[PDB]
Design an enzyme around this catalytic site. Structure first.
Site, PDB file in Angstrom:
ATOM      1  N   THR F   1       0.845  -1.231   0.000  1.00  0.00           N
ATOM      2  CA  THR F   1       0.000   0.000   0.000  1.00  0.00           C
ATOM      3  C   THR F   1       0.864   1.258   0.000  1.00  0.00           C
ATOM      4  OG1 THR F   1      -1.835  -1.082   1.181  1.00  0.00           O
ATOM      5  CG2 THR F   1      -1.778   1.314   1.244  1.00  0.00           C
ATOM      6  N   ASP F  17      -2.828   4.177  -3.882  1.00  0.00           N
ATOM      7  CA  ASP F  17      -2.811   3.199  -4.963  1.00  0.00           C
ATOM      8  C   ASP F  17      -4.066   2.329  -4.846  1.00  0.00           C
ATOM      9  OD1 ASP F  17      -1.749   1.662  -2.671  1.00  0.00           O
ATOM     10  OD2 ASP F  17      -1.346   0.114  -4.178  1.00  0.00           O
ATOM     11  N   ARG F  19      -3.945  -1.426  -5.177  1.00  0.00           N
ATOM     12  CA  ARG F  19      -3.567  -2.841  -5.084  1.00  0.00           C
ATOM     13  C   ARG F  19      -3.727  -3.351  -3.658  1.00  0.00           C
ATOM     14  NH1 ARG F  19       2.349  -4.899  -7.086  1.00  0.00           N
ATOM     15  NH2 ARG F  19       1.262  -4.669  -9.095  1.00  0.00           N
ATOM     16  N   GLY F  47      -2.240  -1.326   6.245  1.00  0.00           N
ATOM     17  CA  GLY F  47      -2.142  -2.354   7.282  1.00  0.00           C
ATOM     18  C   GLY F  47      -3.195  -3.425   7.081  1.00  0.00           C
ATOM     19  N   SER F 129       3.551   0.337   2.744  1.00  0.00           N
ATOM     20  CA  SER F 129       4.787  -0.299   2.272  1.00  0.00           C
ATOM     21  C   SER F 129       5.564   0.542   1.254  1.00  0.00           C
ATOM     22  CB  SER F 129       4.481  -1.672   1.663  1.00  0.00           C
ATOM     23  OG  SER F 129       3.646  -1.557   0.522  1.00  0.00           O
ATOM     24  N   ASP F 166       7.632   0.051  -5.216  1.00  0.00           N
ATOM     25  CA  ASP F 166       7.179  -0.843  -4.142  1.00  0.00           C
ATOM     26  C   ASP F 166       6.313  -1.971  -4.708  1.00  0.00           C
ATOM     27  OD1 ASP F 166       6.574  -1.818  -1.487  1.00  0.00           O
ATOM     28  OD2 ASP F 166       4.647  -0.784  -1.640  1.00  0.00           O
ATOM     29  N   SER F 169       2.563  -2.150  -3.627  1.00  0.00           N
ATOM     30  CA  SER F 169       1.663  -1.172  -4.233  1.00  0.00           C
ATOM     31  C   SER F 169       1.646  -1.311  -5.748  1.00  0.00           C
ATOM     32  CB  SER F 169       2.106   0.238  -3.858  1.00  0.00           C
ATOM     33  OG  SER F 169       2.359   0.333  -2.467  1.00  0.00           O
TER      34      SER F 169
END
Ligand code: MG
Ligand code: MG
Ligand code: MG
Lengths: 233, 196, 125, 212, 222, 226, 204, 195, 195, 196
Positions: F1, F17, F19, F47, F129, F166, F169
């Site tokens: 994320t 994002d 995803r 999270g 993330s 990342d 994401s």
């Protein structure tokens, strides 16, 4: 098997049209203690290669001596030691990579992440990574530790793929690197303001810049920030 | 974290860095660790942010309700309410709080409350991870009944060193001056204090 | 202390009348007129803002209240009793419906929940 | 895994499944669990690994060296013991192996040796090894006789693997049949369990629980 | 404690044709949630018309490929420049892998080429050297996403001929190199969508009697 | 994320994002991470996905009731206080990491909330993330007195850094702009830089390919009359 | 040990043109041991269909629970529950066991009776909703189902084409999973007719 | 305890249950009946942790007997099995769960059909033609898969059951001291005293 | 493996040893002879960890057979037992010890006396009138203590041994598939084929 | 332990406390942590006493044998021999050593060798448990090319603070002066340094 004691943080690097740039701050941390402020973590080998090292500093100093010894050994019975049979970045890297993987395979690693930056005999840019596990990879941008998470994203906006390398000048590349170093200073709790930057160009050769500082920092906005939610004063 | 509170002639000054880290990542480089529980009773927070905020919010509530019934509370009273929470909930809290305040009767007072939940009234107090590196400096350089300008220089120089050596500490040096005159906020940027 | 009134205050009289309900309805009868009319493409509810004093700001006193975005309520009788019912009606629309089905309750079911609250005051201790 | 081997009048029947799993993930449905040590000896693969492959092809090298030096076919007893003595040296290191070394010689006749990574070496008439061994044992024990025909014995081994393939989640794919005679082993084909199941269900009237 | 192993992600795919073979693999190299390189070659030409890929922990993968390439070189020296057949290469790799049985090369190895009759061949190895010739094999991170698709679209599993209703299976007709490359690309496109470690680029090596040819295709970079 | 929040001249913008992942597998390729606490108070979550949704609905519900009770439009500080006290009570077991933003009669606001109950104030924030990739972009390009168009550009550029660099994401960029004295505009799929390319082949099967054993009509209707 | 993979099994749902499809395998096991080949994992409450993978005792418990709740819903609302509303109910019900959850992977499928819009949704064990347009997967072979669905699926399939796609997606995924298989069922759902088909597959 | 089997034939359900009771190193009893009659036409065999097994079995028995008196009516085997499953499903998330697996063999007098239900300690219910708990199924199911027919007589069911017990006696390491067999049919429950 | 017994009577030593070989969940064999003849008048039964048992037994056998050839002379049972003890005592402090317990039953031709030695895997040797290893002694020793006499005949020794085996078959949980009995006397070693 | 070495105009001075503890018990309150590996090359020891003594003894042996063959060794050479032992045996050593020495060519030099086995040449070095408390003080008060009297005061004041705050440190302050003039030992008692 050990644990790292005195450590060096991010090493960042990128390719540009005529060569490579590499940078790393001058800090030797001792856990949360910012112990040593005058540690050089870029170690040039000849006039065509610079090895940037993060992680355990005692192991870095060992690697430093191996490279110093490598140059000596290469000169033995070698009339072309400063010409055709001089050390290449690709030679220096492969040697380190061999050592790193051998050491991990004996369960006694050199606790480091290394980036070998340089320019080859034929003018080709060399930029490759190796770490304590002996894992190797190459890319237009390479970074260790926090650099991987924060520097790469910024450097990849300049050189996103191979075809972007000839379009990137040394001034644009150095600007991106210097900005990345500032971002790391803002956000990495084990970084320092002072750093070293090295440029290896196929035309102008090796330019090694010491005692650089992060500048043009934004802090003024901090005065307006008050409390953690409801507090006004 | 590097935090300190220092009493002087005209009252008391609280000082703090602005770095909050999650491991080696700096989650917030402009944190305000100087927090207000009453008009002229503030505190410096160290340890768990969630805990120290939760405590500070409850204290602020208690001193607000105290004021509604019994008028302005003493700095000692504020420190007692902090202590009561920290001591009785010591098993579930990681909080190191310095309480500083200004009465007209008592003038500048500083109380430190370490992990245990104990209370210690002091002329000055230092705390947080970065305080370890300046015990020597602060002890050698502190004097009682300093001026406002001397006390600002003492805190600025002290936290400068704490920041220099502690990776957990950094950013701007925030300060809050508590005197009869009122409440004055001060900020000092890296370019200023690093060259000291 | 303790609420020692754990017995019903509303009870059947010999004639089968529930006195307190009848008397409550008498209190509603004294209350200011309010009405409702249903159209094909809408509903309207209306009432008189009986101002207790000209110095009072009658805009602050809302006799017509939003319960959900699509449901409204108006009353006749004791204003304070209405005010608390609206608070309970708004909450019950969330607790016993929206937090379960992710949408606001239909009119009839919210009405049912309000009715249940009023019934309990007719039998509880 | 399900592997079985049994002695009878006509020699030895060896039957194995073909499935290989890594946890719940079916890695392969086409695994060869019968090693062809040489033209006269067979070995089964249960245990979890390369260990049976590697060390039984090695066994074939040792059997070849034996008959080069001794000018005589190695006995099933000697061949099996070369393997058991080897794995016993590695005992503790973590080898995982459960195999039947099957052969038919003049001096011994049809012989089966269960060899184990714990060093166990057992001679026997019927053996079943793997996660679906208990299912295979049920069919074998209730239907086994010494005077089975080569045709019926082959079917019994096939049907016993099928029984395991059905119930045991970690067995299936296909059935490999072998028939060991004194003049050597004879391969009796790969049999897809998917097709075999419906074929057997109809012809045999079994598996009435399952809807087909 | 020092952990000598790591996971560099990636996914590889080997498919054996009638007179050819392909060994494909994505060019993304990763650790945890970070991308190391968007183009780090994973499938290698090892000489003698053999292609190899050791997917998993890249350090062990690179070591194995290096040692096998070295094995090909010494095979030529020792045996009068004899061509190493794919079946012989496979057996040789087993011994390289089993040599470290108690401290394994943490990789799922696949090689591809032609057998001695000129037909397509693919061999598949577990980390400790158990191996088998196969017609179809995906390996690595998204192997579980690709193999079921290949069972269906290469071997025509669960597919039957319309009208017969489960009685007659779809016949196993041979696939051309152009038909295989389509399935390879769609496998990696699908894998890229649903697996975070797969993306950036797809590099395919095609082995025929004429030699080894390469083909590169872009993949999504998110 | 990757989720970000950026303050500007006359308001605040948040972005995210799209995803959502289960381990290394992408569960949803177009997940909606921007949640509405109230009409002009929106937040983004990272999270534990259930916890972020659950905690925003609960606080959002109580905020609505509070707004009706007080006859006042809800405040961001109220949402902030209610969220942090709830999260602190459960001591991180509710794994909700939120960036809360919005406009109210007090002004425009931007906060972050961590699962243990700590909160932070800022002009630019990032969580998840891909927060380090996003924060790198924010630290490189952020300035005081950003316009609405500059903040949307900055916010979405920060999410992109997360999308590309990342692995946690990816896919699309959702944006929500909350300006003072205006309705908040939710820009679902503001950017779409990750459309899948056309496949090489159609995998539509011939009818009657699958083997069938039994067919039957299912009775979904109620018990019938007569 | 891992509750979600003791019994095994899978569910997959897909959308088509004016139709949805939901399908499941029939296996119930005790790890390696196959116990039942008739354990259906798809249930329905009116026109709303619910597939449930995971721990079998919870699959049974939740079915019984949603039957309970949708029956009371119908009596009070005087109408059958819709897929969108039911999805929220499933999410609510799962999250109320946040710190003691049902070890399940539910999948909702159905067509809204009023709008006629095809609807599918999926959840994790704790209640997080995954509302996908294309398809939802669940169970011990979810990785395999993701791989199958991602390549096989194309939008706006007709009911009789969608059947072939979802069937081949399930079958080939289950054949690569040790804890799935032993039969399969596919529901083809249209606005006012539902066809249920048992598939012939390998029984190992 | 150890081995409990069940098989539903044409007109009856047959439950076999071991006699051994081992506590540590010694076999304390070789004649233990691991079953309870819940109602005239419903029998439940059980196996699991010591104490829990009987405590649970008797608790269920009391509850069904209470229902039988209250309504003056025997619950269907299906209804009883659903009740039992729920108790186990409730149990598994308790402070200390019942560690008990059961087989419920009953004859439904309404439908005139025998019924066999298998329920484990988690509350995992399945209706089967033949069933087992623990390691019993590993040896027996292959034989039952092969020989079982839905139209078997009670005498044929017993012969197939003997073949299962023989295989268990051959290949199981534990001596379970034989089995007590009971038949459930339209006439009620009776014990096969010679087996 | 499981149960190994030994009893020294008037003129012979009798060794009983179970036939079962269990590997995990299944009984792979029910006719296993857990003994080796070391010399014409010396027999050694053994039980312990898989592989180690036979490996050790055969190693001892080879060494005694080597001694028998070299010297053209049979070692006394006492001498053999001392050799075996030393090997186990050496073994226990090795990198990987032999996990093997043995009974050595022999007839000393010089002294014309039967002799039974009990040696565990630690190298703990004891000469006994009757002995056992593992849990076998727990069940049997009380019977042997009661009935044993030093002047018993071989037929009486076998009857007392049957009583021991019956008690084991009654009270042990494990099915050890009966025992192979062997007698060691002045005439050598022979097997009782019906027991 | 509180140890430090400081270079100045005429050479270098090593300074150390005298407390050696086993837990909270002071096993030796008059320890000599300043140890001689050569005539004018000394070292300060911190960490495991057994280890640092064993190392120092080996170094002394190496420099004795070096002198027999190649004449007087450099301070750098001594530091390298220390490093070689500490680095190659890092897994089995807990040693933090400061090496200080005086050449005539190089004058006063200070090398610190922390746990890792790394070498760091510095103008001055501090180490041991008590050093943490005087990083701030030493950094603020150190100057290059101090006099002998200034350097003694700098070390005395520094170790005074380290001792004051660190329970592991205490006793007397020992010092060893290394110059061209020779080798001078100094001792300072509690009554002297505590009142500073
Ligand atoms: Mg700092
Ligand atoms: Mg199976
Ligand atoms: Mg806490």
């Amino acid at each position: 098997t050990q644990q790292p004691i005195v450590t060096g943080t991010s090493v960042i690097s990128m390719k540009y049209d005529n060569g490579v740039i590499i940078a790393a701050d001058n800090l030797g941390s001792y856990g949360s203690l910012l112990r040593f402020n005058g540690v050089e973590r870029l170690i040039p080998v000849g006039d065509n290669t610079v090895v940037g090292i993060s992680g355990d500093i005692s192991d870095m100093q060992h690697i430093e001596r191996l490279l110093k010894d490598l140059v000596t050994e290469n000169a033995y019975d070698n009339p072309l030691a400063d010409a055709e049979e001089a050390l290449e970045p690709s030679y220096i890297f492969e040697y380190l990579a061999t050592v790193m993987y051998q050491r991990r395979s004996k369960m006694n690693p050199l606790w480091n992440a290394i980036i070998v930056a340089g320019v080859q005999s034929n003018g080709d840019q060399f930029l490759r990574y190796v770490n304590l596990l002996g894992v190797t990879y190459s890319s237009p941008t390479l970074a260790t530790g926090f650099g991987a998470h924060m520097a790469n994203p910024l450097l990849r906006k300049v050189v996103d793929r191979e075809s972007d390398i000839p379009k990137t000048t040394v001034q644009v590349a150095e600007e991106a690197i210097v900005n990345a170093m500032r971002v790391l200073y803002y956000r990495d709790a084990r970084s320092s303001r002072n750093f070293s930057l090295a440029i290896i160009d196929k035309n102008t050769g090796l330019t090694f810049k010491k005692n650089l500082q992060v500048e043009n920092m934004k802090w003024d906005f901090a005065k307006d920030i008050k409390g953690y939610g409801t507090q006004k004063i | 974290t590097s935090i300190m509170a220092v009493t002087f002639k005209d009252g008391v000054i609280l000082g703090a860095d602005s770095r909050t880290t999650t491991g080696a990542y700096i989650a917030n480089r402009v944190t305000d660790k100087l927090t207000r529980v009453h008009d002229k009773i503030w505190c410096c927070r160290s340890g768990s942010a969630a805990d120290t905020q939760a405590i500070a919010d409850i204290v602020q509530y208690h001193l607000e309700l105290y004021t509604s019934q019994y008028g302005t509370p003493s700095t000692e009273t504020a420190a007692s309410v902090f202590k009561e929470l920290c001591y009785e909930n010591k098993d579930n809290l990681t909080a190191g709080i310095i309480v500083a305040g200004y009465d007209d009767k008592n003038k500048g007072e500083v109380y430190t409350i370490p992990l245990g939940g104990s209370v210690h009234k002091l002329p000055y107090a230092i705390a947080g991870s970065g305080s370890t590196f300046i015990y020597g400096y602060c002890d050698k350089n502190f004097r009682e009944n300093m001026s406002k300008e001397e006390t600002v220089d003492f805190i600025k120089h002290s936290l400068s060193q704490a920041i220099k050596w502690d990776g957990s500490s950094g950013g701007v040096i925030r300060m809050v001056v508590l005197t009869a005159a009122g409440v004055e906020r001060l900020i000092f940027y890296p370019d200023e204090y690093e060259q000291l | 202390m303790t609420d020692r009134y754990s017995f019903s205050l509303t009870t059947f009289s010999p004639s089968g009348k529930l006195g307190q309900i009848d008397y409550a309805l008498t209190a509603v009868k004294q209350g200011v007129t309010s009405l409702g009319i249903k159209a094909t493409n809408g509903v309207v509810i209306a009432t008189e803002k009986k101002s207790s004093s000209p110095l009072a700001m009658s805009e602050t006193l809302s006799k017509v209240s939003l319960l959900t975005p699509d449901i409204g309520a108006v009353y006749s009788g004791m204003g304070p009793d209405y005010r608390v019912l609206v608070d309970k009606s708004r909450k019950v629309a969330h607790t016993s419906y929206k937090r379960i089905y992710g949408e606001y309750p239909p009119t009839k079911l919210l009405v049912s929940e309000v009715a249940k609250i009023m019934q309990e005051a007719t039998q509880s201790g | 895994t399900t592997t079985l081997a049994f002695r009878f009048q006509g020699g030895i029947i060896v039957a194995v499944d073909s499935r290989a799993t890594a946890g719940n993930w079916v890695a392969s449905q086409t695994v060869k669990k019968v090693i062809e040590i040489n033209p006269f000896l067979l070995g089964t693969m249960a245990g979890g690994t390369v260990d049976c492959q590697f060390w039984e092809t090695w066994l074939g090298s040792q059997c070849r060296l034996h008959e080069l030096r001794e000018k005589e076919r190695i006995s099933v007893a000697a061949a099996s013991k070369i393997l058991s003595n080897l794995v016993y040296q590695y005992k503790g290191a973590g080898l995982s192996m459960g195999t039947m070394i099957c052969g038919y010689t003049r001096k011994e006749g049809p012989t089966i040796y269960y060899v184990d990574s714990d060093g166990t070496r057992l001679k026997g008439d019927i053996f079943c090894v793997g996660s679906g061994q208990t299912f295979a044992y049920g069919v074998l024990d209730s239907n086994y006789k010494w005077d089975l025909s080569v045709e019926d014995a082959l079917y019994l081994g096939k049907r016993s693997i099928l029984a395991a393939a059905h119930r045991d989640a970690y067995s299936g794919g296909s059935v490999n049949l072998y028939h060991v005679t004194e003049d050597g082993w004879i391969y009796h084909g790969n049999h897809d369990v998917g097709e075999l199941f419906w074929k057997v269900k109809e012809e045999e009237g079994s598996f009435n629980n399952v809807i087909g | 404690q020092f952990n000598p192993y790591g996971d560099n992600g990636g996914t590889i795919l080997g498919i054996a044709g009638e007179d050819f073979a392909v060994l494909a693999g994505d060019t993304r190299n990763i650790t945890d949630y970070s991308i190391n390189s968007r183009y780090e070659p994973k499938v290698f030409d090892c000489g003698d018309n053999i292609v190899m890929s050791a997917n998993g922990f890249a350090a062990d993968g690179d070591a194995l490929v290096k040692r096998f390439k070295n094995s090909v070189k010494w095979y030529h020296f020792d045996h009068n420049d004899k061509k190493l057949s794919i079946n012989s290469a496979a057996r040789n790799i087993q011994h390289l892998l089993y040599g470290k049985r108690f401290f394994p090369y943490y990789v799922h190895t696949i090689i591809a080429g032609l057998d001695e009759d000129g037909k397509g061949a693919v061999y598949s190895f577990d980390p400790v050297g158990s191996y088998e010739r196969e017609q179809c094999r995906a390996g690595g991170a998204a192997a579980s996403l690709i193999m079921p698709f290949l069972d269906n679209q290469v071997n025509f599993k669960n597919q039957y001929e319309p009208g017969t209703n489960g009685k007659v299976k779809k016949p196993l007709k041979y696939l051309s190199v152009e038909e295989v490359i389509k399935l390879v690309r769609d496998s990696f496109t699908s894998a890229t969508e649903r697996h975070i470690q797969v993306g950036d680029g797809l590099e395919i090596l095609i082995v025929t009697k004429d030699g080894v040819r390469k083909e590169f295709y872009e993949l999504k970079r998110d | 994320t990757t989720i970000v929040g950026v303050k500007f001249n006359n308001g605040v913008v948040i972005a995210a994002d799209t995803r959502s992942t289960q381990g290394p597998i992408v569960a949803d390729k177009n997940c909606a991470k921007l949640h509405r606490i109230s009409p002009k108070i929106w937040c983004a979550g990272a999270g534990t996905a259930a916890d972020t949704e659950a905690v925003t609905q609960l606080i959002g519900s109580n905020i609505e009731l509070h707004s009706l009770y007080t006859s006042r439009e809800p405040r961001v500080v109220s949402a902030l206080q209610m969220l942090k006290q709830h999260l602190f009570k459960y001591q991180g077991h509710i794994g909700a990491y939120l960036i809360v933003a919005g406009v109210d009669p007090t002004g425009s606001h931007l906060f972050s909330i961590h699962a243990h109950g700590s909160t932070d104030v800022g002009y630019y924030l990032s969580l998840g993330s891909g927060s380090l990739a996003a924060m790198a972009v924010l630290e490189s390009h952020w300035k005081q007195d950003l316009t609405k168009e500059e903040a949307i550009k900055l916010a979405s550029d920060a999410i992109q850094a997360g999308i590309w660099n990342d692995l946690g994401s990816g896919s699309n960029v959702d944006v929500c702009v909350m300006e003072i004295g205006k309705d908040a505009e939710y820009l679902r799929n503001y950017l779409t830089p990750n459309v899948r390319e056309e496949k090489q082949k159609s995998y539509k099967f011939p009818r009657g390919t699958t083997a069938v054993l039994k067919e039957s009509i299912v009775n979904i209707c109620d018990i019938q009359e007569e | 040990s891992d509750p979600s993979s003791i019994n095994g099994g899978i569910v997959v749902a897909m959308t088509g043109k004016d139709c949805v499809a939901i399908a499941c395998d029939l296996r119930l096991g005790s790890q390696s041991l196959g116990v039942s080949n008739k354990f259906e994992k798809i249930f329905h409450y009116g026109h709303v269909f619910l597939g449930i993978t995971g721990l079998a005792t919870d699959v049974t418990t939740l079915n019984e629970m949603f039957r309970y709740k949708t029956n009371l819903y119908k009596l009070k609302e005087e109408r059958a529950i819709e897929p969108e509303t039911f999805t929220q109910l499933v999410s609510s019900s799962l999250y109320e066991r946040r710190f003691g959850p049902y070890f399940v992977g539910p999948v909702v499928a159905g067509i809204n009776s009023k709008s006629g819009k095809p609807f599918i949704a999926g959840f994790d064990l704790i209640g997080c909703i995954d509302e996908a347009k294309d398809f939802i997967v669940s169970g011990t072979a979810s990785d395999q189902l993701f791989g199958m669905c991602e390549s096989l699926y194309e939008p706006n399939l007709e009911p009789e084409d969608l059947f072939e796609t979802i069937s081949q997606a399930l079958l080939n995924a289950a054949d690569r999973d040790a804890l799935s298989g032993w039969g399969a069922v596919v529901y083809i759902i249209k606005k006012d007719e539902v066809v249920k088909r048992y598939l012939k597959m390998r029984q190992d | 305890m150890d081995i409990i089997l069940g098989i539903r034939v044409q007109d009856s359900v047959i439950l076999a249950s071991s006699k051994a009771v081992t506590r540590g190193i010694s076999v304390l009893k070789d004649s233990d009946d691991k079953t309870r009659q819940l109602s005239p036409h419903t029998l439940m065999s059980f196996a699991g942790e010591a104490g829990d097994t009987v405590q649970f079995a008797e608790y269920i028995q009391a509850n069904i007997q209470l229902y039988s008196i209250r309504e003056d009516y025997e619950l269907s085997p299906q209804a009883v099995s659903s009740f039992v499953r729920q108790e186990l499903a409730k149990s598994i998330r308790s402070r200390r769960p019942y560690q008990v697996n059961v087989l419920i063999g009953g004859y439904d007098k309404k439908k005139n059909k025998p019924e066999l239900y298998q329920i484990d300690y988690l509350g995992t219910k399945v209706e089967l033609p033949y069933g087992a708990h623990g390691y019993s199924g590993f040896y027996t199911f292959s034989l039952l898969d092969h020989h079982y027919r839905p139209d078997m007589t009670t005498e044929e069911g017993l012969d197939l059951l003997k073949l299962c017990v023989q295989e268990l006696e051959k290949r199981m390491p534990m001596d379970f001291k034989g089995v007590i067999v009971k038949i459930v049919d339209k006439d009620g429950i009776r014990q096969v005293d010679d087996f």
